Amino acid sequence: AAASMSALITENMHMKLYMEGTVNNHHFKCTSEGEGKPYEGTQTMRIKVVEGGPLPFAFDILATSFSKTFINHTQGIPDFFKQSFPEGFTWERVTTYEDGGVLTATQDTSLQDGCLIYNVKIRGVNFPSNGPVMQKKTLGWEASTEMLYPADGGLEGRADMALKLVGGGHLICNLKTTYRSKKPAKNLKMPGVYYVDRRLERIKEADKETYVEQHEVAVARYCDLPSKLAHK
C-alpha cells in the first residue's frame, strides 16, 4: 500500500479546481490552481471568481471548500485520503452558522496525469441579509481542530470554526462532513479516531475578493496527553 501511495502521491503535487454554486440567490463560478507538499501538510491555492463576481457575500464562507490529500499524518495514523488513490474520494459537508446561514458543499477529488483535480459544488441558504457575511464584515478564520472518526467504511469529521469580525468578536459555525473513498474497503487501512489541527490563512486578495490566495497547514495527531486507561 505504501508502495502505491509513494508512486501516486509525490512529495510535491499540483492541483486544479472548478467550483460552481449559489449563496442565497446569487450564482457564481470559481477556478483555482495551486501546489503543495502532501506529506508536510502545506498547500497554496490561487483562486479566481470567474462568474458572478464581485460576490455579494464574504469570500470567507467559501474558504473550506477549496483539499484533504494535504494533511501531514503524524504518529503512524493511517492516511485514508492518500490511500484512496488512484481511485480518489469525495467529501460532503454542511456548515451551520449560529446566525442561521447554512452552506452545503459536495466535492470530488481525482488524480489525472499526476495532477490533483477538484470539482466542487456549493449551495448556501438563509444567510441573514443584514448579517456579517452578506455585509462583508469578516476578517478570516481562527485556527481549528477537526475530529475525524471512522463510520461505515468511510470517515466523518466535526469541527467548530470561528470567523473573525470587524470590531473584534467572532461568528461561530459548525462543520459536519462525510469523507468517502472510491477505493474498495478491502483495500483500505482504516485509522481510529484522530484530530487535524489547521491554520488556513488568506495571503493575498484583489478586485473585491474576485482574486484570492489561500494557504493552509494541516497536521494530524492523536491526543498527546497521557491516558490512565492506556488509550491512544
Answer whether the bond into residue 128 is a cis peptide, omega within 30°. no
Q: What are the φ/ψ torsions at residue 81 (nearest 5 degrees)?
A: -75, -45
Task: Round to whole Å and give the CA distance between 115 and 108.
Answer: 14
CA 1 to centroid of chain Cα atoms: 25
* Cell numbers given for 150: 471512522
Nearest CA to 191 out of 94, 73, 98, 112 is that of 73
Residue pair 173/95 in contact (Cβ under 8 Å)? The answer is yes
Domains and CATH numbers, the chain: 1-232 (2.40.155.10)
Q: Which method was it determined by? A: X-ray
Task: Round to whole Å and give the CA distance between 122 and 126.
Answer: 14
Answer whether the bond into residue 226 is a cis peptide, omega within 30°. no
What distances in angstroms separate CA 4 from CA 76, 118, 167, 190, 222, one per listed residue?
17, 21, 50, 16, 25
Rounded to the nearest 10 degrees, how much is the dihedral formed by the CA atoms of 146, 64, 36, 11?
Answer: 40
Task: Round to whole Å and give the CA distance between 6 and 17.
Answer: 23
Q: How many other C-beta atoms are found inside a 10 Å radius of the C-beta of residue 189?
A: 10
Task: Round to whole Å and give the CA distance between 61 and 140.
Answer: 9
β-bridge pairing 211-221 and 72-73:
parallel
Residue type present at position 34: G
Task: Round to whole Å and give the CA distance between 36 and 175.
Answer: 24
Residue pair 177/157 in contact (Cβ under 8 Å)? The answer is yes
Task: Round to whole Å and give the CA distance between 48 and 227.
Answer: 47
Q: Write out the DSSP string of the chain.
A: -HHHHHHHS-SSEEEEEEEEEEETTEEEEEEEEEEEETTTTEEEEEEEEEESPSPSS-GGGGGGG--TT--EE-TT---HHHHTTTT-EEEEEEEEETTS-EEEEEEEEEEETTEEEEEEEEEEE---TTSTTTTT-EEEE--EEEEEEEETTEEEEEEEEEEEETTS-EEEEEEEEEEEESS-GGG-----SEEEEEEEEEEEEETTTTEEEEEEEEEEE---S--TT---
Task: Round to whole Å and give the CA distance between 82 and 38.
Answer: 9
Nearest CA to 148 out of 120, 176, 114, 184 is that of 176
Cβ burial of 151 (10 Å; 0-12, 13-18, 19+) is exposed
The resolution, in angstroms to one decimal, equals 1.9
